[PDB]
From Swiss-Prot, chains A, B:
GO molecular function: ATP binding; identical protein binding; phosphopantothenate--cysteine ligase activity; protein homodimerization activity
Clinical disorder: Cardiomyopathy, dilated, 2C: A form of dilated cardiomyopathy, a disorder characterized by ventricular dilation and impaired systolic function, resulting in congestive heart failure and arrhythmia. Patients are at risk of premature death. CMD2C is an autosomal recessive form with variable severity and age of onset ranging from 2 to 20 years. Death in infancy or early childhood may occur in severely affected children.
Name of this chain's protein: Phosphopantothenate--cysteine ligase
Underlying gene: PPCS
GO CC list: cytoplasm; cytosol; nucleus
Lineage, broadest ranks: Eukaryota, Metazoa, Chordata, Craniata, Vertebrata
Similarity comment: family membership: Belongs to the PPC synthetase family.
Substrates-to-products reaction catalysed: (R)-4'-phosphopantothenate + L-cysteine + ATP = N-[(R)-4-phosphopantothenoyl]-L-cysteine + AMP + diphosphate + H(+); (R)-4'-phosphopantothenate + L-cysteine + CTP = N-[(R)-4-phosphopantothenoyl]-L-cysteine + CMP + diphosphate + H(+)
Amino acid sequence: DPVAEFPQPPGAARWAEVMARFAARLGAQGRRVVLVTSGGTKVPLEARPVRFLDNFSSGRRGATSAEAFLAAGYGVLFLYRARSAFPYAHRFPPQTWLSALRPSGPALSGLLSLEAEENALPGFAEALRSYQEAAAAGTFLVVEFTTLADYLHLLQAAAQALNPLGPSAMFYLAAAVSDFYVPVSEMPEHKIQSSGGPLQITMKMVPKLLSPLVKDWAPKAFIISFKLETDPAIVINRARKALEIYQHQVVVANILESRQSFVLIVTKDSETKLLLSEEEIEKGVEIEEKIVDNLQSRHTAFIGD
Amino acid sequence: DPVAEFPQPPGAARWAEVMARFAARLGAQGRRVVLVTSGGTKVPLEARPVRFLDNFSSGRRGATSAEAFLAAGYGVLFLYRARSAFPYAHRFPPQTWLSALRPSGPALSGLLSLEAEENALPGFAEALRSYQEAAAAGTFLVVEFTTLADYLHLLQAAAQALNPLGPSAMFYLAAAVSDFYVPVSEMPEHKIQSSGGPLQITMKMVPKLLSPLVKDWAPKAFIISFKLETDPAIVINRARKALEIYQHQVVVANILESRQSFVLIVTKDSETKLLLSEEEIEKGVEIEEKIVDNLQSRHTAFIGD
Ligand SMILES: Nc1ncnc2c1ncn2[C@@H]1O[C@H](COP(=O)(O)OP(=O)(O)NP(=O)(O)O)[C@@H](O)[C@H]1O
Ligand SMILES: Nc1ncnc2c1ncn2[C@@H]1O[C@H](COP(=O)(O)OP(=O)(O)NP(=O)(O)O)[C@@H](O)[C@H]1O
Ligand SMILES: CC(C)(COP(=O)(O)O)[C@@H](O)C(=O)NCCCC(=O)O
Ligand SMILES: CC(C)(COP(=O)(O)O)[C@@H](O)C(=O)NCCCC(=O)O
Ligand SMILES: [Mg+2]
Ligand SMILES: [Mg+2]
C-alpha cells in the first residue's frame, strides 16, 4: 500500500522466493538470521534520468558487519547498494590486485595459475577462504538494489522471508535511505536543461516504513536501526525519539566525522559507548566486531525472554 | 578565477606537479597524450554533507576508451570518479574473483600461489598483462576525484600539464559534470531534517568551463566533448550548438538508452554514425574501439595541418 506508488525492481517475485527459501532452510537448522542493509539509496528527478539525489554511504559499515555476523555463526541476508563495499573484497581495490597478481605461465589443462608477493596482498588468502566457506555452507545471500524504489520493495520481501523465524531473526538497518522524492506524476520527461536558469525543485517526504516494518511485516523480530547525525549536541535525544516513535529495540547512534571509531548503543533506558582503543587500532580490530559482539549478546537475551 | 569559489582538493599542488612531469616525459619521447575524464561529479547540499546531487555515469565509456587509447600508442592521463569503472578490472567484479581464485597452498618463501578455472575468469591473464605493461612503460597516470570542486581544480591542473604539447595533446571529456550547485555561503551547517516538511532547494548554474579551457588553458589542443541527451528529436541540433558556442573540434553525441551500441561523431560541417554490428557484437568488439579509431585518425590530420 505505501510501497505501491514506487515501481517494482526487475525480478522482484523471483527474489522474494529465493529469500524465503534461504531463511526457511537456515531456520530449519536452528540458526539465527540477520538482514544487513548497506549502502545508500538514490532517487531520480526526471523520467529518463541523468541525475539523482543520493544519500552518502561507502558500505564499509555494512560489509564489515556482514563479515563479523558470519564469523559469529549467523546466516546473513545482505541487501546492498550495487557496487558499494562488498564483504572480504573491499580491502583489495582494482589497482591493488591489478599490480600484485601475475600469471605463472599460460593456462594449461584449463587451469590458470597466478602468483603474488604475500606482503603486497596481506590477508588475501584468508579473505578467499572465508567467502568460499560461507558460499559452501549456504549462509550468505546477496541481493542488490540501486534506487529508493528497489530498496523499499526488497526490504518488504526480506521482512516476509524472515517473519516465520520470529525472535530468531534480526534486522540491522545500516542503509542510508532517501528522505525525499519526486512522485512519478510530477517528473519532467526529458533531461533538465542547464541553460534554463536555476534548478528549483520541491521534493515530497518519503514515508517512513520503519513503522509498518515493526508493527505489521515482522512484529516478532529483533530490530536494530542506525541514527546518523552531524550535530553532537542533539544525537542522544534524536536516538531516543526514534525508539519512542517506532517502538523497536535498539538504535546504533553515530556522528558522521567519527563513525569509524565511535558508536553509541542506545535503548529506551540506557546508553553504551563503544570506542576503539589505541591498543586495538594497532592489533587490527574494527568497530563492527565490537558492535556485533554487543548485539549478539542482546539478541540471546531477547530470544530467551 | 571562476574555479576560486570551490575548495581545492587535498594535495592539488602535488597532483599538478605529477601531471606536469608525466606529460613532459611523454612529449620528450614524441608520444601523443590524451586526458580521458570519466565518471560523474557530485555536489553537496549541506556543509557537513550526508546527501549529494550526483550526475549519472558508470565510467564504462571512459575505462574502455582508456584501454583503446593505450593499445593505439597514446599516453593516458585518466581523471576519474573514485570507485567508478577502472580500466581492465571493470570486467571482473568482486563476487567473480572471490569465488574463482583459490590458494594452492600456504604462502612459502614470501610467495602466494593461486589457481582458477580459466573458463571462470576469461581474459583475466591478458588484463593483468596489459595493465602491467602500461605501468612499466609509464604511459598511464590515474588521478581520482569525487566532488564537482575536486573535478574543476584537477581539470585546470591537467590542462596546464598538457598545454606545452600543443596539438599533440587530446582532451576526451566523457565525464558527467554537475550542472547545478549550492555556493558555500548558502548551505545549512547540519543535516537537513526530514520532519521539517518538503525539501525546497534552488541551485545556481555551474559556470561552463569548456570556454576558458578552449580559449585560455589549452588553446592548441585537440578537444573532444561528449553531448548527452534523452530526446532523439533534438540531439543533432544540440551537438552543433555546442561547437558554435565553445569553438572546439568534435562532439561525440549519444542518447542515454542506446549509448552502449551507438554514437554520432559531429563536427561543424558533418555527422558520422558509429553503430555496432550483429557480426561485431559476437566477435567481442566494443563501441569505444571504433570511437578511438575515428578520433586518432582525425588527430593525425589536425597535427599535420
Ligand atoms: N561545468 C563544466 N566544466 C567543464 N566541462 C563541462 C562542464 N559541464 C559539462 N562539461 C562537459 O561538457 C560536455 C557537455 O555535457 P552536457 O551535459 O551534454 O551539456 P551541457 O553543456 O552541460 N548542457 P546541458 O544539456 O544543459 O547539460 C561534456 O563533455 C562534459 O564533460
Ligand atoms: N523511508 C524509510 N524506510 C525504511 N527505513 C528507513 C527509511 N528512512 C530511514 N530508514 C532507516 O531508519 C533509520 C534512521 O535513519 P536516519 O536518516 O538517521 O533518521 P530518519 O528517520 O530518516 N530522520 P532524519 O534525521 O530526518 O533523516 C536507519 O536505520 C535507516 O536505514
Ligand atoms: C554512517 C553509516 C551510513 C555508515 O557509513 P559507511 O556506509 O560505512 O560509509 C551508518 O553507520 C549509518 O549511520 N546508517 C544509517 C544512515 C541513515 C540515513 O541517512 O538513512
Ligand atoms: C553517457 C556517458 C556518461 C557514458 O556513460 P557510462 O559512464 O559508460 O555509463 C557518456 O558517453 C557521455 O555522454 N558523457 C557526457 C555526459 C554529460 C554530462 O551530464 O555532463
Ligand atoms: Mg534520514
Ligand atoms: Mg550538462
